Structure formats: structure tokens, C-alpha cells
Symmetry: C3
Amino acid sequence: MKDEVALLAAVTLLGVLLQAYFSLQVISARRAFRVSPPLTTGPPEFERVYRAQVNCSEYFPLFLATLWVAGIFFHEGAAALCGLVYLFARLRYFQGYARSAQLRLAPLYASARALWLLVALAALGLLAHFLPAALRAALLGRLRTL
Amino acid sequence: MKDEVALLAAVTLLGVLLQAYFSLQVISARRAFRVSPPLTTGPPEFERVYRAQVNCSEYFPLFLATLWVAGIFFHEGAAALCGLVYLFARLRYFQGYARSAQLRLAPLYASARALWLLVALAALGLLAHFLPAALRAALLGRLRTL
Amino acid sequence: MKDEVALLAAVTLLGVLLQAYFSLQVISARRAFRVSPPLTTGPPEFERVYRAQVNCSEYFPLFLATLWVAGIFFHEGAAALCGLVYLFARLRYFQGYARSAQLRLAPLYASARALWLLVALAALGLLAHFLPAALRAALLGRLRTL
Ligand SMILES: N[C@@H](CCC(=O)N[C@@H](CS)C(=O)NCC(=O)O)C(=O)O
Ligand SMILES: N[C@@H](CCC(=O)N[C@@H](CS)C(=O)NCC(=O)O)C(=O)O
Ligand SMILES: N[C@@H](CCC(=O)N[C@@H](CS)C(=O)NCC(=O)O)C(=O)O
């Protein structure tokens, strides 16, 4: 059903492109600092670029999972918008962290707020889905008795 | 189609929340042991918490992929239940590993059993989907000749 | 809708199995080189196997995201085929890297070509989806004026 998930798919693809950009930046840093695989250690500046990419990579599935659940169960447009805010914050996090550990913090907090909102939308969407059938099953069981 | 995937979505969200918990625990360990990014090395106790989170993060997409394939092609309820068992085992793995490398092992084995079962359900679901059309195409080709 | 995504699901499961294989190979290397968690450092040969697995793991969500978007918005068969080429290239990357850092390069380039093609298919699929409604909204706005 292309129609109900195309914005989620577009934000998903933008996320992939951003992760590709982070990967290309790590490769560029490896060349500049002459840090050859399999090493992932070197001068703090190399290690910051490496770490910024790794941190973005490990949250990326959380972002995808929440984006799709929130977008399907809550509202597609709102999930997509929160996803865009998340991804812009991650770009700033990567750029910030590369420059200095301390500059990762403000955009990290912005990314965490965007992701927490997606989590909240996904949870509310699922509650709206399940809570009714559950409260009903509960009541039908108490009616039987009563 | 909210209706046929809501339990998969709920287990997915629970998985996201658990990964968020692991991330918050690593941040707490960084503060306690004063290990500042970009370092990921320090006392064994810090390194165990870091590593437990990283290991959970790298299997998390495998869990999501298998959960959804098994849930769609085999049975939603069974996939969801195996997913819940996986996630509880991962929580125990994280808690165990943080305390000691050796305490990661029992829950790691439980998580691997749950994930292997999801893989098996997904494979059986796909076999049920493809094998028929394939054996038919095979037979139609031999009938033509015969 | 099993019917329109079964090949994407099958390539997804194959990807999971391959990642499981990489994980089992790292465990085998840990035993052979006696590198106990939480360490991820040791002789270059151990570090290459570890790193090859980690690199495959961090691209794996990019591969899944692009596979599904390309397969849904562009063409299922073509996305599945590019996915298979990607996964075979990753197997070669892992085998190559384990033997030597330099032997990772050719299969890395092949994997990057396959993934870039998936990205391109996904983008073209989404453009075909959105561009029309957008150019129409644009024109309706200029017609009103004109
Ligand atoms: N893998 C992360 C998990 C926790 C996390 O996301 N921490 C934040 C705030 S300390 C971070 O920017 N981590 C820096 C990094 O991963 O290099 C870590 O090692 O810290
Ligand atoms: N990235 C993992 C891949 C293999 C794996 O999952 N190993 C298990 C059993 S040795 C584990 O608990 N790894 C500990 C860790 O990742 O820190 C590793 O380095 O070991
Ligand atoms: N995490 C990767 C991101 C960039 C990347 O994929 N680099 C390629 C070409 S240098 C690679 O084979 N990395 C080796 C590795 O990750 O161990 C890295 O540290 O290099």
C-alpha cells in the first residue's frame, strides 16, 4: 500500500542517505589521519568522527522502528515530521561531535526529544488500538458474573 | 493494515524501549566511571556495560527483521511470543553481562534459542509460501514433456 | 499482503542468516585467539574478523530499509536481485577482510554498488510516487492565478 506509507518511506530513504554521508566522512577521516582498518583508534579528532558515525548507526534502527510504528498507528504526517526533525538533529550531532565532544550535546538532546516523541506517538497509537478491546473483554467478563 | 500486525508493532516498541534503557545505562556508567566520549575503554566494569549495550544493538535489527517476517508469514501471535522471550532474555543478558562477563552466557543462550526459533518460523512460513508454486512449475514442465 | 513482498522477505531472511554466520565466526575467532569479552582488541587477525562483522552489522539496517522501499516503490524482483548481489558481496567482504584488510576492498566496492543501486531504485520509485501530485499542485496554483 504505497499510498499510506510513502512519507514514511521518503523519511526512511533520507535517513539512509544521511547514514551513507556519515560513512563517507569516516572514510575521509581514515585517509586524512592515515588510520587503516582494522584500527578504530587514533587521534581524538579521528575517534570523534568514527564515534559520531557509530552512535548514529546504532540508533538508526530505533528511529526506523519508531517512525514506522508511529506513522502507521498514530498519524503518517506527524511521524514523518518528527522523523525529519530527528534526522536534522542527527546531522548536527555528527557535525558537532566531529568538531568537539562537547558540541555533540545540544543536538544529541534535540535528537532524543524527537525520538521520545516518536516513541510516545507509537505508544499512544498502540494504546488506542488495544485498550478498547481489552477494557471490553474485561467488562464482558464482569457482566457474565454480575 | 493495523489489524494483522499490531502485536508485532507492540513487541517492536517494547524492543525500542529496552534499547533506550540500555543506552541510558551506558550514559549512567560513563558518568560513574568518568569515561568521556569518544572513549569506549576504561575499567572492565564500564567496558562490560558498554559492550552489553553494543551487542544488544547489533542484534536488534536481526530481531526486528525476523519478528516481522515470522509474524507475517507464519503466525502473528507465535512470532510476538518468541519476540517477548527474546527481549526478556536480552534484558537478563544486559543485567548479567554488566555484573560479569560470565553471567552473560545463560541469558545469551536463551536469547539465541528465541531468535533461532523466529528464524525457523520465518523460514517455514516462506517455504509454505514458495514451495508449492515451485513444485507446481516443476511438474508443469515435466508434464509438458511427458 | 504476503503476495507482494515475499521475495523481499526471503532476501531479508537470507540477510539475517548471513549476519548469524558472521556472529558465529567472531565467536570462533574469540575462542581461537582466546580473546574474552569485553575485549574487542587482540592480534590483527582477530580484530579483522571482529571488524568485518561489525561493519556488516552497521550497514545491515541500510540494506533492509532500502531493500523494502525499492521493492515496494520500484519493483519487487529488481530490489530482491540487487539485495542478493549485495549479500553475496558482503559474504565476500567478510571472507576477504578476515584474510587481510586489503582483500576487503574489491567486495566492499561491489557491495557499495549494489546498495547505491537499491538507493537509486528507491529514490526513483518515490519520485514517481510524489512528483506528479506535486507538479499538479504547482500547476493548479498557477492556473488559479492565470
Ligand atoms: N554507545 C553509546 C550509548 C550511550 C549514548 O548514546 N551516549 C551519548 C551521550 S554520552 C553519546 O553521545 N555517546 C557518544 C558515543 O557513542 O561515542 C555510548 O557509548 O555512549
Ligand atoms: N560483536 C560480537 C559478535 C559475536 C557475539 O555475539 N558473541 C557473544 C558470545 S562471545 C557475546 O556475548 N559477545 C560479547 C560482546 O559483544 O561484547 C562479539 O564481539 O563477540
Ligand atoms: N565504521 C566504518 C565506516 C566507514 C566504512 O564502511 N569504511 C570501509 C572502508 S575504510 C571499511 O571497510 N571499514 C572497515 C571497518 O569498519 O572495520 C569504519 O570504521 O571505517
